[PDB]
Design an enzyme around this catalytic site. Structure first.
Site, short mmCIF file in Angstrom:
data_model
loop_
_atom_site.label_atom_id
_atom_site.label_comp_id
_atom_site.label_asym_id
_atom_site.label_seq_id
_atom_site.Cartn_x
_atom_site.Cartn_y
_atom_site.Cartn_z
N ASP C 229 31.73 40.13 7.40
CA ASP C 229 30.81 41.22 7.72
C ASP C 229 31.07 42.44 6.83
OD1 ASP C 229 30.01 43.78 9.40
OD2 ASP C 229 28.84 42.10 10.20
N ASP C 231 29.22 45.15 6.96
CA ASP C 231 28.49 46.25 7.59
C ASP C 231 29.21 46.75 8.84
OD1 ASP C 231 26.31 45.88 5.69
OD2 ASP C 231 25.75 44.13 6.89
#
Lengths: 278, 281, 282
Positions: C229, C231
């Site tokens: 991930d 983000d």
């Protein structure tokens, strides 16, 4: 305090934006900037102007030293960069004479130095992977738009307003650019493909300028000038430059009117947190 | 008045298009061409041939010195460039043995010198932004198509003909090419994406050759040979036959070029270069 | 050594230690120096060589990795196979952080990297090589990675053969397509939307030209992507990625054993032949 750098594209090769205190030549770890820089003030706000292509427009988009330009501005103490970009429209509601405060892009450039960091001698040590999902400084974007409102220039916001309420010449409150490498313009085939992808305008100079600004911890926003017979286009583009100059001047003032302590700190920390070697 | 330059792609590494009157080993401001240029005459028309990859085909598409090639032809007094190009098909109507007179492209090359002008020490001084909306010389395209007709080769034009008129092998009167950098061919994923974009063929040599020709004030048209990159013997013989057809087309095309007056077109070509000089405007 | 497995470790594998070191090789290639020293040793009876793509301190960005030197160095030590890892971002809702992907396709958006061993430049091998890349990976080696996942009790999801409700996370996706961007910046939202609309599953920075060069070298290459991930959210993602690294380690080690358990004479001969037949200069 804030200091606003201005990167001037086409129509800004030799701009007289203000009474200059002086012309300054600087060097950077990444080479020489496009040209000397004009230093001055807009009211009480320090401002620095740098022509992207050099005074004689002798430097093509792909050979512009974006690192040197952005870094020079950083070293002079700039906290913000406002940039102009001449562009072609890919969509019917964006006509020559309009402006676009871009919020997105797609990158088709190559062969340009697009990061300050790396493992080569001519770069800063480290590996920087910057988030770029929303690549501009949003506060600064909104200031450009407010500047347009303040100068009685029409603003068109396609998510707030219907298509029939688009009144030219206007500033589009958002938009996406495809940045091609140049120097040639696109083929019809390429334009159709770019249009099909949903891109709004095509330009040659936005990238990696915008990326390097974020790497430098600077707040960056771009105002594109839609320019899409030659004498008429020049007159239209000359007319556009007058309004862009007005927008830029008002924006510098607007930036100076607010406090940017938290935003600047966030800009700097974002650079630190993106270092993958640390 | 006119002089026709020919850039030979695959199948034309050692052209032998006519009796060589003279050979020229030149050096341009942008380096050496792919090989020596061969001069001579097709009828009364002056012609110059140059193998894009060199005699031994030792030079891959990304490493070809397109600028040197185009400039050397320009310096020799060429007014036109006809180019050949081996390609793979992305659409069912284009099969091996076919030919395409291109009118469009999408560029996916990089790391090639694609302009004569700039601010590098070896660049011509100035900034040149050429229009490329219709990137070929339309008059020269129509000459290639008419040349095919003259050599009894089927011409298929999807704009004005029913699909039943598409009789193989045929010259497709229009077509878009994706130019990839190479030297590898595309993945199935990449091919699917290109096909979805509406591209007709894929090649590795069209760009920046077509761009640089226009910067040089030259009239440029490209004829693509559709072959198979996926029985080898039948494919090779088919490509051999295609090469013969293109040779015939090129020869007829040189003849057709020299039979017309190109004063206005040459002037327009030169003007377009000057009008695209942003450092001057 | 009839078979010998080269391993290119990406993020999470800067300093791998997959087995007891037997020999640390400081090598040079005609294309320059590899990202680091190469570590030789054994997994069971199978000879194996490991190399960190970014170097020990992860100081080498994706665009500056010497893929030629890395692949060639492994070839020079007698490797027949290359297993490679790479971190990636997901573009589709069925691929969540913690998942892995055994890739079978890609779209290339890199530039400025040396992507071939052959050319007319002195820094290259003499000749013009035009390799087919329709299905760019070694299918046998792909299936080894997937079977390896199964043997280590990791969920395997095959969209072609299984129902969507059988996509149980975390899982190894039996196929997938990657867009390889140049970096070092991540994509804009605009770029991601375009890539997703093209049907691509993940985005990475390191797959190309590594996969291309391995084929050019006549090696069997397969890649396993770690979906992470891009983000404290950062603390959670780091923990997820650490678990991903551990599971990929297990997959790689089991895959090496599985490769060692079969004959590769025909497949290896085919790899070498495909190189020779692709020489356009003959």
């Amino acid at each position: 305090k804030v200091k606003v750098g201005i990167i001037g594209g086409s129509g800004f090769d030799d701009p007289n934006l203000f009474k200059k205190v002086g012309v300054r030549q600087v060097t950077t770890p990444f080479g020489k900037p496009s040209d000397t820089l004009v230093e001055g003030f807009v009211g009480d706000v320090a401002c620095v102007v740098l022509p992207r292509h050099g005074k004689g427009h002798l430097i093509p988009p792909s050979e512009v030293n974006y690192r040197a330009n952005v870094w020079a501005l950083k070293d002079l103490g700039c906290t913000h960069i406002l940039a102009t970009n001449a562009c072609g429209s890919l969509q019917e509601d964006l006509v020559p004479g309009d402006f676009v405060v871009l919020n997105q892009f797609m990158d088709k450039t190559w062969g340009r130095e697009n990061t300050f960091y790396g493992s080569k001698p001519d770069s800063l040590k480290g590996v920087l992977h910057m988030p770029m999902a929303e690549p501009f400084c949003e506060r600064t974007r909104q200031i450009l738009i407010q500047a347009a409102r303040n100068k009685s220039i029409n603003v068109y916001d396609k998510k707030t307003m219907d298509k029939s309420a688009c009144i030219h010449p206007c500033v589009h409150a958002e938009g996406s650019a495809v940045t091609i490498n140049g120097p040639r313009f696109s083929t019809r085939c390429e334009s159709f493909i770019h249009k099909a992808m949903g891109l709004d305008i095509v330009n040659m100079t936005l990238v990696p300028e915008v990326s390097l600004a974020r790497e430098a911890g600077l707040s960056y926003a771009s105002i594109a000038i839609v320019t899409d017979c030659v004498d008429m286009v020049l007159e239209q583009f000359r007319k556009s430059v007058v309004h862009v100059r007005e927008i830029l001047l008002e924006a510098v003032a607007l930036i100076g009117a607010e406090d940017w302590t938290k935003t600047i700190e966030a800009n700097k920390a974002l650079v630190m947190s993106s270092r993958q070697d640390l």
